[PDB]
């Protein structure tokens, strides 16, 4: 027992370990397990970073304070040491001799040690199950749920002797009570000051966007590491003193260079640099000496921090012994004086700590979490009126015409960012009708590039492939007997990879109606459960649906024809192909129009602009008359596609004779091109 | 104590560590990890040779300069001494005894000395875990990726003990700056001079051809071995001296035989050999003397290297301790003068160096890599445009005929590699018709064997197989839960293995127009989604499509008649059977004709080559009459299948009775065979 167990109550007796904060329902709960005659060995169940070892240790603090119930007193938690057990040796068989010897040793201690085990399922078990079953060994185990189920949930010793009690992770305010629990410990680790929006924003946003790990832990190493970064920033010499310091080192060692001067007559002219030397000396001693004043302020601050910690260790040892006159002479004696000189120190640091910032901001936590997640917290919390009001201009950068669409859609996005919508629905539910490549593709990449900040959030799934009855098994999930019964279909994998994404559904009318029913279910729910066996949320994505029934009616219906016509017979075609309660579950019915010749001209322009970039690579620009712009305007257009042969007319009239000529060497970089017209085409000239 | 530890800091103090170049950021991140109290122990995660130990030692250089922040002021780093554990460990158990005792007197140091351990996955050491749980020491680790992932991913304690730090393989340019750093160390240790394009081209070729190692280490080995080999040339006796040494030692053996003369008219002739001894000994003496002159001057400039480096060491320690008159003494004093007569020595080699060479150049680099890889210096001095011009000639070496294809397609490949169009396209997107066995895969393996230097970049696709809905399931992949998804798409298999491929397609019009549309997605964007759905990028890959619908008119338009008309009536029929989108996708509408009659004779003797090898292995030699060759040309040729029946017509017609005649003994080895013509059969004649 000298070799294999750590007395946790000893380190609690030195105050070497932190107090637990909160979670006394779990503590009392475990106390309600420890009382028990059989199942003397409880099983903690929880995730990493939860606090279960702190449950054990604060339980030991309740032991050493005697605040545990009577009879539970008299026994001492000495937890099983990791790596004292096997431990490390050349042979096999040592493991069982050590197991035996510690069982004889706890046998001769007569229960007065209660034995905690970290990670029960890893640490076999031959001599264990009898002494467990007798109840003589009053140990304690702790593991996770899933690794219990895979270590095993099943077998008779494990389910027999033990009692599983599981926990939750704490709530946001609960984590605030945690950080207000241990913030003094981290402050004397850190010697900084702490803002309250830093910790409530840390718990809230770390709660929201970190789905992997759990409370409290992600908040803990956010606050800890960020505060360490502030320690490194503070404890280094100030950057103005650094930028001065480099040229001042340069003049003081250039002074070393110019003491033994070669020409006292010819290089007597150096005395200007001797005067600048003295000026940099004066301003240098001023800036440095200001920083020494900061060092005196921060030094006295850390002293009254430390002496307040000594007052708290003293008052708590007075709680352990129960010396009440000692408690009064401490709490009236030391504490209010260090409180008032604390407030004088903090108001003085509110005054003169101009250059250095002991206070940490919520903005620091935003920067560190941006360095983990990748999203800037500017994008969370800039002027939301700036981005949300510039959104229309953002669209009319790369999506031309189509004002009604960007209005209704954009306002829907606005009230989505409001939070006024249902948290039991996906974000945006939209139907689009119109030609392809005229801006639909631009709309998807544009909007995912706006909110989801990249074009990658778009997921295209065509429904033209999905015709037969088996199409639902294709895109959703397979039946058994197949690997797709572990894989699922396309959609579940798509949102399964990208939680924050945009879903695109092309030519959606061709499918069987069995598709359309679960389409109604993802319209109602924002959830669906796959062949694999998991629920997949859609509360962080927007479904975008396109059909091509009345797209040969959408080329004509806008602008110049009535929406009641194509709405009547195409909603009638919905009545053939859906029920319009599905239309009740889409949010908007959005219609597009073909482009005016000015739009077509401008998308020819911005289509050329990337070629102007790639000639900016080589060293060229290009000037084009409205004649040749009418050639790309006429040849780049078709009624069936709109803008899709634009690249075709451009490459076929332009890219091949032009870069033909650069493969002839006829074109000199740094000499500008003007694409002047040919006979009836485009030709190139330097 | 003193026995059981290496201090790195006293080594960087005594210059025993190496200077580091350009890794500040991850050092800063490392300090940000090290300032924590828990999980404060970072793990360097990167490939071997990447710079991890150098990051450690350069951090110790910031220690020994005091450049560290005041959070890490005065803290110590001492490296592990495993060899002192086994020093004196006379019996088993004493190793772990000194391990724990050294762990104790380190454990009383308590954070002042911060340990580094490399190769942490190698580290028993379960006993080292609880002292880490106490934090009585402080550690830095360094291991690999999957070592970590099998290492502390399992131990939930150790993932709370540690933390990831990644170091990627750096820029080429900072690696050049690293060589700028230690180039004084390697020129001064290695006695020679090095130019900067040796560093630059060493980085370019070393980065290009060897990715198995990492930066910087491969370039370090190139420079180290390279310049050390130049110094081996300096050591080695020159070639005039050793050729003359051969001639004098033969002159001493032969003349010594002539000195012990017996014959009158034969051996009294020896005086001409004696004056030849006078000649070769004088010339050997003079070239010998000039070699001692070059070794004299080069020895002198080596001494000035040592003297100037002593000025560097003395000025650096002079800047450490701050000895003022020593800094003015050395800086104003030795280093300008030693640079003056240093330039007298480098100018002195600037004239006098005729016999030996000392400056490290790019030819030396190409030699040293040419002696590692065996890849010739011709390959490395090949520019892009060099093989772009050599494409016609080099493929005409293998593939004679089809000058349309090699010349025109060679122009097309120069256009694609040069930058004609949008880079989001496949490199080669054309149509290459022709019957089977007349040059198709011949030209495929020719192409990939030219531009990718191997035949293996090939996959062939049959559209006539692909008439169904499992077509797409075959070539690009079945959906999940379907047959063939285990095979996937064989296209996605070979392209997913080799991204630099050449794709063959066969008889395109027999397929379904889904594959014309999947095909149309291929010819656009330089990409495609597979049956799984993820993108398969095509911008590094040439596709080749045949159609056998011109088979008989291809085999008649083969010898003599121009093959442009095959291309154009191919545009007639194929334009009729297709849509003009796909027609505008392909750039050159090509068709592979069968070879000429004399070219058929060339193919025939090409197959005869290995046969004649087998013959002259045994002393045989077949001559062939051109007429019997012509009978093979009309016989083994198929107007349907080209010359595919020709090979089986060779073995089937002649070779089995040829085996009966060689094996008969009738045909005698050591004798010429001519393929004379006894009757309509071809029968060999001795
Ligand atoms: N409610 C809490 N009160 C105090 N500290 C807590 C609390 N929750 C978590 N912690 C801290 O979070 C860290 C991890 O919790 P632990 O006490 O080690 O238990 P754990 O998360 O279950 O880890 P285990 O038990 O080894 S799997 C410790 O530094 C705890 O002090
Ligand atoms: N910035 C640098 N300046 C100078 N030398 C460097 C630099 N980075 C890497 N090196 C060299 O690269 C060599 C190999 O890298 P290491 O520092 O050993 O880290 P490594 O990736 O762990 O290599 P190992 O030890 O073989 S696993 C070192 O010995 C240095 O000589
Ligand atoms: N242009 C050519 N030059 C020389 N030999 C050729 C040529 N074309 C075909 N051959 C011969 O015919 C054989 C088969 O033709 P290939 O070159 O492979 O064309 P193919 O379409 O792959 O026909 P296969 O291999 O039977 S599917 C080759 O192995 C050669 O022996």
Distance in angstroms (rounded) separating the CA atoms of residues B70 and A233: 10
Determine the Cα–Cα distance for residues B398 and A207; give it in Å rounded to an integer. 66
Q: C-alpha distances in angstroms, A282 versus A239, A258, B285, B292, B369?
A: 18, 20, 72, 61, 58
| Nearest-ligand number for the alpha carbon of B24 | 2
CA pair distance B164, B44, nearest whole angstrom: 7
Q: With CA atoms as reference, report the closest residue to A400 among A352, A349, A438.
A: A438
Q: How many CA atoms lie within 13 A of B88 on its CB side?
A: 7
Nearest-Cα residue of chain A relative to residue B529: A460
Q: Are strands A76-80 and A5-7 parallel, antiparallel or unpaired?
A: antiparallel
Nearest residue in chain B measured CA to CA from A497:
B534
* Nearest-angstrom CA–CA distance, A80 and A120: 10
Query: How many other C-beta atoms are found inside a 10 Å radius of the C-beta of residue B307?
Result: 13
- Apex A655 CA angle, A649 and A660, nearest 5: 140
Query: Closest ligand to B52 CA?
Result: 2
Using an 8 Å CB-CB cutoff, list chain A residues near B413. Answer: none
CA B624 vs CA A11, A304, B505, B604: distances in Å: 100, 108, 38, 11
CA–CA min distance B344, chain A (Å)? 23
Q: What is the DSSP letter of A122?
A: T
Chain breaks in chain A (C to N over 2.5 A) after: 123
Cis omega before residue B411 (within 30°)?
A: no
- CA dihedral A655→A658→A664→A665, nearest 10 degrees, is -120
Neighboring chain A residues of B420 at a CB cutoff of 8 Å: 655-656, 659-660, 663
Nearest CA among A605, A604, A610 for reference residue A643:
A604
Could you say which of A489, A651, A663 has the minimum Cβ distance to residue B415? A663
Instruction: Please report, for residues A242, A247, A434, B104, B333, the alpha-carbon distance to residue A250 in angstroms, rounded to integers and kept in the order given.
Output: 12, 5, 69, 47, 20
CA distance B555 to B433: 11
Give percent helix, percent strand, percent coil of chain A, each to the nearest 5.
55, 10, 35
Q: What is the 3-state secondary structure (H, E, C) of B173-233?
A: HHHHHHHHHHHHHHHHHCCCEECHHHHHHHHHHHHHHCCCCCCCHHHHHHHHHHHHHHHHH
Asked if B491 and B476 count as a contact pair (C-beta separation under 8 A), the reply is yes
Q: Residue B638 C-alpha to ligand 3 middle, in angstroms?
A: 13
Residue nearest to atom 24 of ligand 3 (CA): B437
Beta strands per DSSP E along B305-449: 359-360, 428-429, 431-433
Q: How many residues does chain B have?
A: 686
Please measure the distance between the N-terminal and C-terminal CA atoms of chain A and give it in whole angstroms: 91
Q: Using an 8 Å Cβ cutoff, are B21 and B181 in contact?
A: yes
Q: What does residue B543 show for φ and ψ, rounded to 5 degrees?
A: -105, 150
Q: Are B199 and B161 in contact (CB under 8 A)?
A: no
CA-closest candidate to residue B538, choices B616, B450, B432, B422: B422
Helices (H), B236-353: 239-259, 271-321, 324-329, 335-352
DSSP string for residues in A608-644: HHHHHHHHHHHT----B-HHHHHHHHHHS-BTTTBST
Distances (CA, A) of A165 to A5, A140, A145, B33: 24, 12, 10, 35
Residues A420, A495: Cα–Cα separation, whole Å: 24
The position carrying tokens 């009659």 is B597
What tokens appear for A482 in the block? 């197949």
Identify whether A216 is preceded by a cis peptide bond (ω within 30 of 0).
yes
- What whole-number distance in Å separates Cα of residue A459 and Cα of residue A490? 10
Q: Give first-to-last CA distance, chain B, whole Å.
A: 91
State the DSSP string of A483-496: THHHH--HHHHHHH
Tokens of A406: 């960007």
Q: How far is the CA of B568 from the centre of ligand 3 (A)?
A: 25
Please tell me the distance from the alpha carbon of residue B608 to that of residue B626, in angstroms, as a whole number.
14
Shortest distance between the Cα of A390 and any Cα of chain B, in A, equals 31
Closest to B111 (Cα-Cα) out of B63, B74, B159, B148:
B74
Other beta carbons less than 10 A from residue A423's beta carbon: 7
Residues with Cβ within 8 Å of residue B35, at least 6 apart in sequence: A228, A229, A231, A232, B71, B72
Beta-carbon contacts of residue A477 (< 8 Å; ≥ 6 apart): A484, A485, A487, A488, A489, A492, A530, A531, A532, B481
Question: Both tokens of residue B680?
Answer: 């309509």
- What is the DSSP annotation of A275-342? HHHHHHHHHHHHHHHHHHHHHHHHHHHHHHHHHHHHHHHHHHHHHHHT-HHHHHHHHTTTHHHHHHHH
Report the C-alpha gap between B131 and B499 in whole angstroms. 50
Q: What is the CA radius of gyration of chain B?
A: 37
Residue B168 backbone dihedrals phi, psi, to 5 degrees = -85, 170
Query: Is-contact A60 A10, C-beta < 8 A?
Result: no
CA of B644 to the centre of ligand 3 (A): 7
> How many Å lie between the centroid of ligand 1 and the Cα of residue A309?
22
Burial (CB count <10 Å: 0-12, 13-18, 19+), residue B379 = middle
**A380-416: b (≥16 Cβ within 10 Å) or e:** eeeeeeeeeeebeebbeeebbbbeebbeebbebbeeb
Residues of A in contact with B124 (CB under 8 A): 88-89
Cβ atoms of B572 and B380 within 8 Å: the answer is no
Of A50, A19, A291, A258, which Cα lies nearest the Cα of A165? A50
Residues with CB under 6 A from ligand 2: B 18, 20-23, 46, 48-54, 178, 181, 216-217
Spatial separation of the C-alpha atoms in residues B202 and B369, rounded to whole Å = 9
Which residues from chain B sit within 8 angstroms of residue A655, using beta carbons?
A: 420-422
- Return the residues preceding each gap in chain B, C–N over 2.5 A, or none: 123
Q: Considering only CA atoms, which of A558, A541, A260, A561 is closest in space to residue A425?
A: A541
- State whether residue A243 is helix, strand or coil: helix
Cα(B682) to centroid(ligand 3), Å: 24
Distance CA A638, CA A646 (A): 9
Q: CB distance B481–A473 less than 8 Å? A: yes
* Token pair in block for residue A330: 């401490």
Among B647, B664, B656, which Cα is nearest to B681's? B656
A257 CB-contact burial (10 Å; exposed 0-12 / middle 13-18 / buried 19+): middle
- Two tokens, residue A475: 């895109």
DSSP state of B79: E
Say how far apart CA B192 and CA B223 lie, in whole Å. 11
Residue A144 counted as an annotated binding residue: no
Token digits of residue A128? 């264990």
Any residues with Cβ below 6 Å from ligand 3, and which? B 399, 436-442, 595, 603, 643-644
Q: B561 near B520, Cβ under 8 Å?
A: no
| Rounded-to-integer distance, Cα B68 and Cα B75, Å | 10
Residue nearest to atom 14 of ligand 3 (CA): B437
Q: Which of B137, B40, B32 is nearest to B80 (CA)?
A: B137
Please give the distance of CA A18 from its chain centroid, rounded to a whole number: 28
Query: What gap in Å lies between CA A410 and CA A366, rounded to an integer?
Result: 27
Q: Would the CB atoms of B36 and A225 count as touching at under 8 Å?
A: yes
Q: Are A659 and A617 in contact (CB under 8 A)?
A: no
Task: Report the distance separating Cα B634 and Cα B615, nearest Å.
Answer: 25
- Among the partner-chain residues B37, B92, B415, the one whose CB lies closest to the CB of A189 is B37
Q: In what order do the strands lie in the sheet with B113-118?
A: B5-7, B76-80, B113-118, B139-143, B41-45, B162-166
Q: State the Cα–Cα distance between residues B23 and B30, nearest whole angstrom.
A: 11
Q: How far, in Å, CA of A333 to CA of A330, rounded?
A: 5
Whether the Cβ atoms of residue B430 and residue B411 lie closer than 8 Å to each other: no
How many Å apart are CA B359 and CA B375, to the nearest integer?
A: 24
Per-residue DSSP letter, B614: H
Ligand 1 atom at minimum distance from A119 CA: 27
A550 annotated among ligand-binding-site residues? no
Strands A76-80 and A113-116: parallel
The residues lining ligand 1, judged by C-beta closer than 6 Å to any ligand atom, are A 18, 20-23, 46, 48-54, 118, 142, 178, 181, 216; B 156
Q: Do A648 and B126 touch (CB under 8 A)?
A: no
Measured CA to CA, the distance from residue B533 to residue B517 in angstroms comes to: 16
Helix axes A172-190, A196-209, angle to 10 degrees: 120
User: What SS3 state is found at A41?
Assistant: strand
Resolution (A): 4.6
Which residues are registered as beta bridge partners of B194?
B360
Residues of B in contact with A98 (CB under 8 A): none
Specify whether the CB–CB gap between A395 and A552 falls below 8 A: no
Tokens 């192909």 sit at which residue? A577
Per-residue tokens: A136: 């003589």
d(CA B65, CA A436): 65
Instruction: Report the alpha-carbon distance of residue B200 to residue A399 in Å, rounded.
Output: 46
How much is the CA Rg of chain A, to the nearest whole Å?
Answer: 36
CA distance B645 to B648: 5
Report d(CA A102, CA A78) in Å as an integer: 12
Taking alpha carbons only, the member of B416, B430, B424 closest to residue B585 is B430
Two tokens, residue A287 = 């800036």
User: Which residue's C-alpha comes closest to atom 31 of ligand 2?
Assistant: B54
Name the pairing type of β-strands A501-506 and A541-546. Answer: parallel
User: Using an 8 Å Cβ cutoff, are A409 and A590 in contact?
Assistant: yes
Q: Which long-range contacts (CB under 8 A, 24 or more apart) does B60-68 make?
A: B60/B8, B60/B9, B60/B11, B60/B12, B60/B17, B61/B12, B61/B17, B61/B19, B61/B20, B62/B27, B63/B9, B63/B12, B64/B9, B64/B12, B64/B13, B68/B31
How many CA atoms lie less than 13 Å away from A567 in the CB half-sphere? 10
Residues 6 or more apart whose Cβ sits within 8 Å of residue B482: A478, A482, A484, B473
Contact partners, residue B322, CB within 8 Å, separation at least 6: none
Structure tokens at B416: 């694609």
Residues 6+ apart with CB under 8 A from A86: A94, A95, A98, B126
C-alpha distances (whole Å) from A14 to each of A7, A58, B107, B254 are 11, 14, 18, 97
Alpha helices in A482-550 (DSSP H): 484-487, 490-497, 513-524
B287-290 contact pairs (CB < 8 A, 24+): B287/B238, B287/B240, B287/B241, B287/B244, B287/B355, B288/B241, B290/B355
**Tokens of residue A65, six digits:** 């304070």
Angle (CA) A432-A435-A436 rounded to 5° is 90
Residues of B in contact with A49 (CB under 8 A): 160
Residue B537 phi/psi, 5-degree rounding, is: -75, 135
Nearest protein Cα to ligand 2, atom 8:
B51
Tokens of B281: 């000994």
Quick one: how far is CA B92 from the chain centroid? 48
Residue partners of B681: CB distance under 8 A and separation at least 6 = B653
Estimate to the nearest angstrom the gap between the alpha carbon of A610 and the chain centroid: 33
Q: Is A77 annotated as a binding residue?
A: no
Q: Which 3 state secondary structure label does DSSP give B524?
A: coil
* H or E element at residue B537: strand B535-537
- Can you tell me the distance from the alpha carbon of B200 to that of B194, in angstroms, rounded to the nearest whole number? 11
- Sign (positive or negative) of CA dihedral B532, B536, B541, B546: positive
Helix (H) or strand (E) holding B622: strand B621-624
CA angle at residue A153 from A147 to A159, to 5 degrees? 130
Q: DSSP assignment, residue A457?
A: G
Cα→Cα distances B612→A153, B617, B623, B659, B673, Å: 74, 8, 9, 14, 11
Instruction: Take atom 3 of ligand 2 and give the residue whose Cα is closest.
Output: B20
Give the integer Cα–Cα distance in Å for A301 and B296: 70
B52 is in an annotated binding site: yes
Query: Which of A14, A52, A82, A120 is the best residue to mutate to test the B interface, defined by the most B CB atoms within 10 Å of its own CB?
Result: A82
Q: Do the beta carbons of residue A405 and residue A590 sit within 8 Å?
A: yes
């Amino acid at each position: 027992l000298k070799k294999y167990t750590i007395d946790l109550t000893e380190r609690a007796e030195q105050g070497k370990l932190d107090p637990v904060i909160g979670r006394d329902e779990e503590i009392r709960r475990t106390i309600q397990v420890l009382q028990r005659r059989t199942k003397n060995n409880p099983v903690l169940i929880g995730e990493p970073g939860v606090g279960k070892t702190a449950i054990v240790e604060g339980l030991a603090q309740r032991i050493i304070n005697g605040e545990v119930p009577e009879g539970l007193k008299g026994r001492r938690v000495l937890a099983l040491d990791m790596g004292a057990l096997v431990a490390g040796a050349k042979y096999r068989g040592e493991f069982e001799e050590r197991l035996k010897g510690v069982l004889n040793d706890l046998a001769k201690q007569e229960g007065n040690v209660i034995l905690f085990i970290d990670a029960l399922h890893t640490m076999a078990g031959n001599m264990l199950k009898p002494a467990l079953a007798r109840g003589e060994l009053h140990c304690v185990g702790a593991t996770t749920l899933d690794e219990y189920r895979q270590y095993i949930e099943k077998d008779a010793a494990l389910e027999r002797r033990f009692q599983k009690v599981f926990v939750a992770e704490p709530s946001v305010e609960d984590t605030i009570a945690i950080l207000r629990g241990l913030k003094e410990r981290y402050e004397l680790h850190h010697h900084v000051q702490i803002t309250d929006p830093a910790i409530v924003a840390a718990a809230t946003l770390s709660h929201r966007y970190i789905a992997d790990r759990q409370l409290p832990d992600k908040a803990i190493d956010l606050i800890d590491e960020a505060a360490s970064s502030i320690r490194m920033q503070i404890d280094s010499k100030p950057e103005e003193l650094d930028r001065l310091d480099r040229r001042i080192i340069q003049l003081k060692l250039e002074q070393q260079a110019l003491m033994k001067e070669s020409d006292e007559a010819s290089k007597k002219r150096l005395d200007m640099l001797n005067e600048e030397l003295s000026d940099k000396e004066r301003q240098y001693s001023e800036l440095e000496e200001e920083w020494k004043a900061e060092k005196a302020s921060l030094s006295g601050t850390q002293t009254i921090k430390a002496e307040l910690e000594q007052a708290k260790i003293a008052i708590e040892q007075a709680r352990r012994v129960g010396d009440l006159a000692r408690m009064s002479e401490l709490q009236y004696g030391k504490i209010p004086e260090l409180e008032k000189q604390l407030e004088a120190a903090t108001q003085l640091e509110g005054k003169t700590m101009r250059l250095l910032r002991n206070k940490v901001t919520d903005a620091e936590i935003a920067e560190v979490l941006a360095r983990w997640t990748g999203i800037p917290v500017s994008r969370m919390m800039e002027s939301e009126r700036e981005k949300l009001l510039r959104m229309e201009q953002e669209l009319h950068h790369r999506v031309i015409g189509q004002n009604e669409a960007v209005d209704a859609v954009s306002n829907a996005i606005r009230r989505s960012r409001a939070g006024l919508a249902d948290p039991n629905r996906p974000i945006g539910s939209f139907l689009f009708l119109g030609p392809t490549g005229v801006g639909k593709t631009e709309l998807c990449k544009a909007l995912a590039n706006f909110m989801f900040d990249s074009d990658e959030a778009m997921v295209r799934i065509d429904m033209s492939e999905f015709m037969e009855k088996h199409s639902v098994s294709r895109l959703v999930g397979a039946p058994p007997g197949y690997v797709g019964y572990e894989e699922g279909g396309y959609l579940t994998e798509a949102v399964r990879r990208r939680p924050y994404s945009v879903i695109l559904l092309d030519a959606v009318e061709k499918a069987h109606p069995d598709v359309f029913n679960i389409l109604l279910q993802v319209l109602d729910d924002g959830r669906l459960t796959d062949g694999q066996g998991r629920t997949v949320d859609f509360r962080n994505t927007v479904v975008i649906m396109t059909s091509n029934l009345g797209v040969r009616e959408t080329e004509r219906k806008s602008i110049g024809l009535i929406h009641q016509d194509n709405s009547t017979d195409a909603m009638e075609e919905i009545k053939k192909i859906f029920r319009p309660e599905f239309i009740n579950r889409i949010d908007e019915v959005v219609v597009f129009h073909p482009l005016g010749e000015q739009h077509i001209a401008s998308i020819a322009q911005i289509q050329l602009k990337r070629l102007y970039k790639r000639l900016e690579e080589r060293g060229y620009e290009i000037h084009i008359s409205d004649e040749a712009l009418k050639l790309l305007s006429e040849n780049g257009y078709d009624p069936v596609y709109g803008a899709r042969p634009l690249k075709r007319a451009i490459q076929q009239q332009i890219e091949n004779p032009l870069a033909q000529q650069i493969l002839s060497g006829e074109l000199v970089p740094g000499k500008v091109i003007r694409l002047e017209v040919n006979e009836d085409r485009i030709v190139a000239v330097q």
